[PDB]
Amino acid sequence: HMERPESELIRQSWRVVSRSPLEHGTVLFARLFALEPSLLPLFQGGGQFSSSPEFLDHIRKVMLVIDAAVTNVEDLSSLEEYLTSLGRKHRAVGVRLSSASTVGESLLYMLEKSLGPDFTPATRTAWSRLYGAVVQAMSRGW
Numbered sequence: 001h002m003e004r005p006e007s008e009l010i011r012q013s014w015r016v017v018s019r020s021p022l023e024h025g026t027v028l029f030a031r032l033f034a035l036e037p038s039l040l041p042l043f044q045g046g047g048q049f050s051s052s053p054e055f056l057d058h059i060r061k062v063m064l065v066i067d068a069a070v071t072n073v074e075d076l077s078s079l080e081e082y083l084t085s086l087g088r089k090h091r092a093v094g095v096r097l098s099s100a101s102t103v104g105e106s107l108l109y110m111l112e113k114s115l116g117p118d119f120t121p122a123t124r125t126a127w128s129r130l131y132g133a134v135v136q137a138m139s140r141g142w
């Protein structure tokens, strides 16, 4: 249950991000590594000491999952099976549920750099509710 006005703030903001999803994704992950640098060694070439996802491929996959959430922002329930399963995949490779707040922060930081004054209080609140619903779905696997 997200109403039209808030759904539209998400859809509009997401169109701005979707002009350049790898460039915005690199901003999300640059912030995430600043907050939680222990996550870098899960990526190919992310380790001091050298199956692992490659960094830009995984960004594409991340932005494709957010795209699906944005497409279903009014009701996320067609997605709960996938998200439950995606949460389990992440848990199994050592990504704690605690990292959900770090990804959240990093997502809000990427949106704020993409949108400037168009990142309105209501846009921020709507994206937090959307992200929270996604993490809730995923945390039935974490």
Ligand code: HEM
Binding pocket: 039, 042, 043, 051, 052, 053, 058, 061, 062, 063, 065, 066, 086, 089, 090, 093, 095, 099, 103
């Ligand atoms: C701390 C944050 C994250 C880390 C460290 C991370 C890391 C990884 C790792 C290691 C894999 C490979 C797992 C495996 O082979 O089973 C993976 C797969 C994936 N990640 Fe992430 N991920 C993170 C966040 C996200 C988020 C927030 C999304 C989407 C909202 C996402 C989307 C995906 C997708 C679609 C895959 C492919 C799943 C599959 O192999 O079936 N990731 N990620």
